[PDB]
Symmetry: D3
Subunit: 300 residues, 6 copies
């Protein structure tokens, strides 16, 4: 019968996707996080897997949908899939910052629900818990959080903070590990309340939604805002994310670096920028002065 | 059933992939290429779809595989799938530069065989048709080409030139001469002085070169400096890197090409400009020749 | 009598200030704006003098106050720009405008000077909050025109379009668009960035656009970033984008080159249809003559 | 009676100027200069206030005039583009007044008047012959004046002031350069000297920490200020650790971009093994040696 | 005997030097200068060869000496440029010019070569002191033309203007302005910066300007800085500013890219009407064909 | 008799050339190389003089010819003067050549050493180079043939012969040299193209300073390494300093070494480069490890 006639569309898709298979699922599993450090992976968009030195695995904003698949905004997904949600086994908590599509996913929920411990909590704002319950997540499996709330997941202390009434909609997270803290801001705009968090907490690595806003739209932070956030949070490292995912929001992360160079001495910036790549790993504090990530080029 | 129980790995995949669905298939179909111009789309890696003013569609090196999927060379595919091969309907020729896995695809051949006219030729070197016939493509739909051969597909005249990856059976370079202009496809060739031969013998408007960051001890992709040397030798007006998008381990900054060009262009009287493309994006010769950098539509 | 004994603090101040004397007052008065063009002067902060081809003289946000003069609210805001125009030397004027009631935009001494030295013909134009200041200061209500987004005021050659302001509403602040036969000028006052710049860019033709720029202190959002300046120019579909307000406050001192560098990186990819322009206080701009200049420099002589 | 009807031109001027009021006067007075350091303030043009660790206050080239105020009709279009950061009439604590040369921009009758009325009986006026002559004429008693030639040393409380050679394009009676040696470091004030090879002489003979040079964009057909490349050559010649441009702030027609110095420095520093860094100051701003020597660019206090 | 045993130091030298041989000699002779243009060659240091459309050949500041050849003019000055032109291969010439008497500009071996090889009529034009040296070396006084600032010497279709120099006078140093039908060339010899460049720019139409460039050692001023190179271009109202002299001495090694970088920062703000141009020794320049190239490269062949 | 008639072409040449005379010859023998260091000089092209802490003198690929001297066949003209006089060489311990190409071997240098130096100084190179040396008259007994793998000890300098790299067996024609001294090592690649086997040399040996043949390739020619290649070689060799040479000698191959620096500034952090580039000048000195961080060389200024 030959191959050019026995092959169907379904047979191609289901043997090719996701792009990375379970390579990163395995890498995360095999990672031994040294004392005094923490490890994290960029999962696309605002998705971050976080692993403390105690071995605690935390997943925040992991999204596995796509953009426009037909003509029937031109938002097309420009990043591949680095992590297979259905290959996830070890997990200690699933988190969401807000209920916007790019941040919360049914497939991630379904995957965890089928394959993981009947004990893994789904942590998010009221509207996210609402959205989870509707997909079939039991209410007892959910932890509703609002600004001020502190959730202890093993050695990872999760602080829910203000995002920019709205206490139902969105939160920012500060992940306190024994090796360092991670600030995750979701799809938030720039707010002066970043400075409040910088005054009340020690923040090491800060993540913020970067992207090129189309004419007449403001949904992402600019290159200048990225630096203002780093200054306000008193961070040591500022990493842009979210700029990877959408065709129409395609942005140059180098803008952040160039402005940083111009402003760092005059404004006494106490942080460095760092340009990540999707699927890539970051280790605090080992990678803090690196500036630019590159994938493993080969073992050799 | 709740969605956390009904959804499986397989249904999620069939719902999400390819990422772009048929969006680009539809855009390529709707594209009215104006006289004196040609349109093309970057399909990932060295994959190029070309459409001339006469509506002639051509697909070169369209690869739909992936890199490593498990730990059981750490090459991971870093490019999403912008085109659905099984959505292809209008096509006049399928082309391959060489037999290397990243340039010839069974699923693409299967898709064209199932959905397109029994008139569409499969053009490539001897090693390529051997794979095609082996997969079940009729020997009658394949055309074997070697350096020097010229094939006519509607208004697009395809010139098979020397490749720089015995040899002649394995790999060729293509020069697609349309009425609107010409395109040079170098596949995965290394740098060669014989680019000067092509630039001397042929009018070359746009040129594509395999670009990437070579790992320590490996030479497989052209450097930023070689990209500009290729442009000079081919006497092109636009130089566009490709291939740098696909493999994680070869991740390269195409801005190096621009920076070197800014330093060298006046001194060396460069007749071309560099262009930084994005996968899934369109390029129109000659309208986009001075754009320097591609941005996706913003809406 | 010796000079070290005859000189008093008041005698020094009265012969030195304002720094430029009536130099700019003279230059503006004698400037003959060519047909098909308009002339413009930066008066510090967001203060702008505009002169049409028909000789219409319009003044916006002219501020003549200063910052802190002693240690004893909180903020160490010190005026870092000299006084380029003498308000009490203003003679030929057609309209006096203000974007909002904020300190740096509405001035008692400028109003007083106009009342004492200019024609009773000259209208004071601004939002409800601004006229409430003017009336309470001594400007008669018949001289004032209250404006809102949508309102159009014709002053001889110049047509003034009051548009939506994005200060943080309609009683508090307005943006201005000045239509002259030579071209248009967008004055955004002290507005933060908003998407409605695109609205104004769609409905109106905008040639030159001014935006409040500055280096925001930690935990403050009061001025626009260098990136926002480029977004404003894109949304307004302007041909020239010019920062201002970054001159006036010590603690808001910014680098206008930041805008140029970001522009160079973006211009091709984003297809920017405008150029940035770095201006200097007391300086002149002539649309469209100076649109491709990039940077202003004061007259050098010789 | 309404404000509009009562306010005059004089009442506005007298309640607005000088722009900074007495803010900087108070800051200087309150400033506690740490041992091993010296504090310093840019007063505009080439005006420098210097305060040593022992509390000694020194005022150099302080100028409180302005440029053109009207047209009239030949002359250059010089408009003062710097505000007034310091009120001369609010000066109380001072140990010495100095001038580099007799030029209009470097010596001020109103500053002299203010000091004579408000300050101590024994505060000296240090300068070359011609500045002393000018001072004496204004009514400054001559017993309060100290004439200095290149070579002379004047010990004012805590600060050893060395009078050195100044440069044009005779001279000893017209202009001098100052090297201020404090227990916390040394300051080289070159006034409005054009570049000269004898900067190497002062660099060889003296330890110089901070160097100030008159920078500016010279108009076509004029050479009055030093270029950007000149500024770096001065730093190398003086063997300084910090090089700060001044004088570029004051005149509209001499508007210069200080970043020009930084860029050239980045191009030349390693090849020529420069032992200094440039520093871009702002008028009214404080500098502290050696704490700020690596800062590159000044910014005014921002607050919260 | 074998090659290893027979070869002498002196024979090798004669076989090897000058480096370029007669390559540039042949190139200059064969050069068909198009109407409305002029050709130019950099001979090293301040040495220039000019050729008008009529075929008139003029040679300025050609010097064939070298620096220190041993340890034992008391500092390490090594010649860092090869010899691109052989003076003892020169045939056609219509004038020999020198700007001043200092060792690096006037040369005995060149003067001798023109007398021995080149035809009669050929004048030696220079200031008073250079004439004393030519006569002192054995050039007939009938062949020497003494020039002061203000003198005009016509050499076929080339009109030579002797202007003021700015070394360290009138008898000692002159600057030249060469007027050809194709264009003009300003040659400033070894002059430092002066305000009188503006005088020449007002009175004459200057196309190409050459100035002595170099990195001044500590405590020495002998060459112009990159910034002064730009001030000269502005003063002369040139269209093209080309640095020379920076090639010759090891201790003066300079980066002409400084001129370009400073130009990119000032061009717009200061409205420069010229372009910088980085040449290479032995290189050719064609006004106005090359005025926008920015940088020179030697021919590459193939 | 006049000085103008006495002078001949020969008198000029034999008094002016070589340009540097014996300046560098004296400096080399004067040099006191410190313990834990090595010093080296750039003799033009790929010519390197290396001097150990023990006073061992090594001379690699010293060339003293020139390019084209007449038109009547690429236009390759020598753009570098002569810094070292071969006939002033006295103290020498070994003479080395990497391959038999014209630009890397010289009869006059061989002749000079034969005549003026000790009778036990070996001539080291691949067999194609000794065939040339014997053919010129050097006794076969004083010649050491090398292949990749061979190690030759010359005092405290351990000389490793490694694989050289041609594009399109070869061990007869070309080798690469790794010079191991007690104070550090030096990798000299000769005129090799880029190769993957630089990584083999990097893993097996400890390499401090690396030298690569740089230059601008003409259209349709691949003879020199690109700027990007220079960086790749540094990474492969695991070097700490990467220095380009060869780019100096030919007019047609004129290149800008700053490209290597700029590309390095873009790549260094992303790729974790353990080396940094160094721009040398011909005749200059390099001291490892003292000058490893200098980035750019400048000639002594005095």
């Amino acid at each position: 019968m030959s191959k050019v006639k026995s092959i169907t569309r379904e047979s191609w898709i289901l043997s090719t996707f996701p792009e990375w298979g379970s390579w990163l699922n395995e890498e995360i599993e095999q990672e031994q996080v040294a004392p005094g450090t923490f490890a994290m992976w960029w999962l696309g968009c605002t998705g971050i897997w976080l692993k403390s030195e105690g071995g605690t695995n935390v997943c925040v904003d992991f999204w596995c949908g796509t953009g426009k698949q037909s003509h029937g905004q031109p938002n097309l997904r420009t990043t591949p899939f680095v992590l297979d949600p259905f290959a996830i086994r070890q997990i200690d908590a699933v988190l969401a910052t807000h209920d916007h599509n790019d941040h919360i996913d049914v497939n991630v929920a379904a995957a965890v629900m089928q394959n993981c411990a009947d004990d893994v909590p789904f942590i998010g704002p009221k509207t996210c818990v609402d959205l989870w319950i509707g997909w079939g997540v039991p209410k007892e499996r959910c932890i509703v959080v609002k600004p001020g709330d502190v959730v202890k997941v093993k050695d990872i202390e999760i602080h829910a903070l203000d995002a920019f009434g709205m206490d139902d909609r969105a939160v920012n997270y500060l992940f306190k590990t024994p090796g360092g803290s991670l600030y995750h801001s979701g799809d938030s705009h720039y707010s002066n309340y970043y400075a409040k968090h910088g005054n009340e907490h020690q923040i090491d690595v800060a993540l913020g939604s970067y992207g090129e806003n189309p004419r007449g739209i403001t949904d992402k932070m600019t290159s200048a805002d990225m630096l203002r956030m780093g200054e306000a949070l008193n961070a040591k490292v500022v990493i842009p994310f979210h700029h990877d995912i959408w065709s129409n929001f395609q942005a140059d992360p180098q803008e952040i670096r160039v402005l940083w160079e111009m402003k760092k001495d005059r404004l006494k910036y106490g942080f460095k920028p760092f340009i990540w790549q999707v699927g890539g790993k970051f280790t605090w504090p080992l990678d803090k002065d690196n500036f630019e990530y590159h994938y493993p080029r080969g073992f050799d």
